[PDB]
């Protein structure tokens, strides 16, 4: 984002407040736009944004989109008990595959990884 008077800034989402914009805030924003020499968004563009938000909020996600969002949050997932159990089970399956294939090098790494992940309370 960017203030008109100030410069560009990268901000996270939680900084924004759910409270509505007050009259002096919008007036100060208009004064900053006039100082920089900019205009306000057109009413046609305002309606286009409103229709875009309503369509996006009322949209129905597809299976592929839902899986992509789930994979994205799984990449963001630091830890979750169900997911840790599933990962440990998958690692155990990979470990038995490596043991049955007589691969003495992979199995040590999988055992070390399981030891690091494990030791619950």
């Amino acid at each position: 984002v960017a203030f008109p008077n100030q410069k560009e800034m990268v901000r996270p989402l939680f900084v924004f407040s759910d409270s509505s914009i007050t009259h002096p805030e919008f007036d100060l924003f208009l004064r900053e736009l006039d100082a920089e020499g900019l205009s306000v968004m057109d009413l046609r563009d305002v309606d286009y944004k409103y229709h875009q938000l309503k369509e996006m909020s009322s949209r129905s996600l597809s299976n592929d989109e839902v899986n992509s969002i789930v994979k994205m949050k799984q990449s963001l997932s630091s830890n979750t008990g169900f997911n840790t159990v599933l990962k440990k089970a998958q690692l155990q399956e990979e470990l038995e595959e490596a043991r049955d294939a007589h691969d003495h090098e992979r199995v040590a790494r999988i055992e070390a990884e399981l030891k690091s992940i494990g030791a619950e309370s």
Binding site: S17, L43, Y50, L53
Partner: peptide, 20 residues
Amino acid sequence: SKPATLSDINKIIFGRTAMS
């Protein structure tokens, strides 16, 4: 081409909960 009023901006309020 008309300027946007306060109510027009209020129609497109997108809260932090809505962002999440």
